[PDB]
Amino acid sequence: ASRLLDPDTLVELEGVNGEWFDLTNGTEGIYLATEVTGLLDPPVKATYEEPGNFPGARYLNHRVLRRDLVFGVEIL
Amino acid sequence: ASRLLDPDTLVELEGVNGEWFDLTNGTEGIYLATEVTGLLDPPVKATYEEPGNFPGARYLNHRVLRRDLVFGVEILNDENDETWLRRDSAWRKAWSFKRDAKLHITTGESGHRYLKVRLFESPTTDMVTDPRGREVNITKMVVVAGDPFWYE
């Protein structure tokens, strides 16, 4: 019936020198901003062919592409 | 004189592992979410030639193309294994690029038909903020029927 939604989601970056950032709690002064693209599923290119002069199309193949992540960080 | 329009339309998806979703009643916590493109007639390419100087054109061919169905589903964020996260992953498990799911449509006056459907692009949720913190999320579906007709 009545409930506040507060997820236990914790996001961290481990850097190329083994430095760490908590982007959920901002103990390094950095937070993940609103508007993230590229979490959840990676892009897929599906491929179909025309069957000659007949209805529809036939499945050939599909490939998972590189994952492009677009985000921002809020730096105080 | 006065009337309520309340159609008997039932929309169901059978997933690639035989998992079922009622997208009308949402008993699995998932509903079909407003604007649907690509039910009703399939796309057709009609070819005409317009050669020389005579008035108008000649018909050459017409071909039924693949259906690109575009739709969304609204997934309610409830408690335990009825959280948005558990439901959107149960939804994702029903679909494949390689195997056909079936979309079933039933009406009182025309009966039952189904469409064989696959993913054409990866299902997508907008993430302005953490979706586990949202009350409802819409997952956007771009799906193909390569055999473009509805079967009994």
Added chain:
Amino acid sequence: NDENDETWLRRDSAWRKAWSFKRDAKLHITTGESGHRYLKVRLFESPTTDMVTDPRGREVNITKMVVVAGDPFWYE
């Protein structure tokens, strides 16, 4: 969208049956000032309806027609 076999579903179905890509329908126009002429017309794209919500639950629906006359004249 009226009742029984006069529902929108049944009329949009009867309407769709009148048309094809291969065979001509005749669009007939009559006026007092020129009398009667007709145009030989075929589908060029499949008829489409907006489905923001289930069309059976809508009190009126527009079906969009894109049609071609490859013989472009109005005939007596």
Added chain:
Amino acid sequence: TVTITADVRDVTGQPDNQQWVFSTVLRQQDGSILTQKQVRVNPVDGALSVELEPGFAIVVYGEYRWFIEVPETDAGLWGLIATSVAVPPDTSAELLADAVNGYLDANPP
């Protein structure tokens, strides 16, 4: 099943082959369940002909809806339409008989 028929024309005496629709309320008859499927029937150049199960049926044509009692012998469809009843079949009593029959078929003496 019983054969119900009519001959169907337009005002100029040419055949009219638009569909007639037959249905019913959900009920048991001869141990089968009759299921409310709407059945579309084309006249064959006039000559509408459909086999129907006796008792209650719904007829639809264009704008019209009629409730009919199908006889136990062959009949003309217009006679059944002219004699059409207002909405209700009195189905409440049949379900008790169905229950006691189904019970006695499941655990007889």
Added chain:
Amino acid sequence: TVTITADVRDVTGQPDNQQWVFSTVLRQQDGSILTQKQVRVNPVDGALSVELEPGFAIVVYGEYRWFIEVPETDAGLWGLIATSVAVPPDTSAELLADAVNGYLDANPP
């Protein structure tokens, strides 16, 4: 375990193969946990049969929904539905027993 069956037809006596849906609340039978699942069954050539575990089940078919008690031996499906609709759980044992008596007097075993 128990086999429940019917023959299902449209108003013309031709088969109707639309799905019947079977469910139950979470409960225990012979050591098994039985779950909230919905199982979809199609009649084959108009013949319907489904194995069911005895006790409480939910049957949905189009707009209709019925709560049935599946018996410990094989039975016709419509008798279980007729039992659910004709004689609700909170009925008077007195007047229903006299109604049963009245039909038995009209048609003994």
Added chain:
Amino acid sequence: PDTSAELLADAVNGYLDANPPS
């Protein structure tokens, strides 16, 4: 939920004796 089937069974079994069998 509670269900009717035992009640109808008792009523039919009762009258299968109270109007004796043949």
Added chain:
Amino acid sequence: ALKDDAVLIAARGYVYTAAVGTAAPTPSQLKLIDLEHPEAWDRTGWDLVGHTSEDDLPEFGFDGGDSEVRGSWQKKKLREVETEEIADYVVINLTQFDETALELYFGPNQSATPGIFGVKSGSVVNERALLIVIVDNDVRLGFHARKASLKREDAISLATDEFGALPVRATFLDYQSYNLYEWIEEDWFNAVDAPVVYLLDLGGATGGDYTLLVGGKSTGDIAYNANASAIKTAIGAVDDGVAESAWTVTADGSDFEISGPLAVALGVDSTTGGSGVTVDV
């Protein structure tokens, strides 16, 4: 100044509905029907909409109607043209909460149980015929529309010290080649140049009796020798609301001048001589 009799104060009025396409009272009937009992009059099928707001009278609005003057290239103002199609409506403020008013506001009751009005999430089609009678002393406007679509205009008003309200918009729609709507007064629209006098001629008949159809129903049979005052009472008896004092009969020889609120015609004559009796406008 021109016609003071046509100047209108909408002091009281009535709102009715009926099945789509039903006819209103004729202009000669509207002048005499009992407005609180629509079951009493001959154009059957009308029901009262219930109480309506005492302030906030019916507003006869419209959507669209935006217009341009079309100009030539040399600044000549040629003609005025409509850019959007005028959709006429009336807004009606209902002020009783009976099923009569809720069925106009929400559409048909979705509950079967006694004492409940239910509402659901579907789309509703709610088409009616509509009649509004505006009463101004002894003047009576009718407004009639054969088909109006009904919807919620605004939300339900509630207050501690005023009547609650259920505001509906009635939107006029086309039906079977009739007018979209009609205004009604015998005295103000398609008015006659002078009061109509009918001529009744006995045609040289002698003996027997004859029977007029005054106002579209049969009179009590009139003897061939009846004088003007005898005809005055015979017309002023099978009334349909018009008393004897409303008519006037005058004569010269075998020719009678008949005048009054309703129509006159001849139904039956004993046919005892000459041409028989006849009537003309």
Added chain:
Amino acid sequence: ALKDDAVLIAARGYVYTAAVGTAAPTPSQLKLIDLEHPEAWDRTGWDLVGHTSEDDLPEFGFDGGDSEVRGSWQKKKLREVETEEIADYVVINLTQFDETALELYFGPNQSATPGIFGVKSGSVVNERALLIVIVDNDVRLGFHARKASLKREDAISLATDEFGALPVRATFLDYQSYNLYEWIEEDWFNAVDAPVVYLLDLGGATGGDYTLLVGGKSTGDIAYNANASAIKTAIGAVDDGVAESAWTVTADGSDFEISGPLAVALGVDSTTGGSGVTVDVV
């Protein structure tokens, strides 16, 4: 006019919330229940919301309802079409600052500490059933929604000389094939189509005559003794378009029941003996 008993002043009223899907009191129960103590009555689990604004009353509303008459290419007006879907709500102005009002305005208390109401960043799901009873004299119009979602409509307001307010919106939602909401009153909805009757009582008179008004105009003279056929004659004989076949008159001992398409009243009494004549609405 038609039913003046169905005209409404919202002079007092009560708001309750319950767990989602909770049944409201029946139409027959609503005429009797104690509105101050919802813990007492047969359909349990309603709690009072607390005090609410005594002049900014419960305000119904809707969003959407954007609607279009669409016409043909030849300017015929075909039908009227919903374009934006109707979303339907009530606003309630709350005037207690107890936790029972704050749980509606802010959602669940995020503190366990006695004396503290805590609020956090994040979205709240706040579903209830809602019941509103509106009262004027002996009339009690009920309104029920099985599922409403509660949110802040506007800022908390404070004044030096008026009760401060927490404004909440309750938006109605679909649930388990029930109606979206219901209006409850036993007298007003799915009621009996009972015909109007006028009871003519001759008062025990033993001489003279009387004259009814039918449709607001006089009949002739009716003798103190007359059968239903003589009453139906005198009523039908009046100048209006109503036929003597449309009226009905029937006996009940000393009194006649009159029914028909017009109002009936007593115009003149010239009877002798008895109380004098009376005709009354049944």
Added chain:
Amino acid sequence: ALKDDAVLIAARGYVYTAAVGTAAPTPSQLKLIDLEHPEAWDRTGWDLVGHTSEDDLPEFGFDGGDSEVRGSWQKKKLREVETEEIADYVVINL
């Protein structure tokens, strides 16, 4: 109808500021403390803001909070969703 004692008229009131993170008086202390002299309180660090308007009392606003009903393709009203984050504020007239 429930608590008459919980109905509030804000006839007087006091506005204080402290360094970020400072704890308020406990619910029990707030019944007892002298409101004109924060120096006397057990929860130290509070200081009065000065006088504030008696016409323009503290206004508890918020920005955002625009919200929509999510609805099925078959018109079922499912749930309300907040479109924008509620940014919550008080306006004080010093």
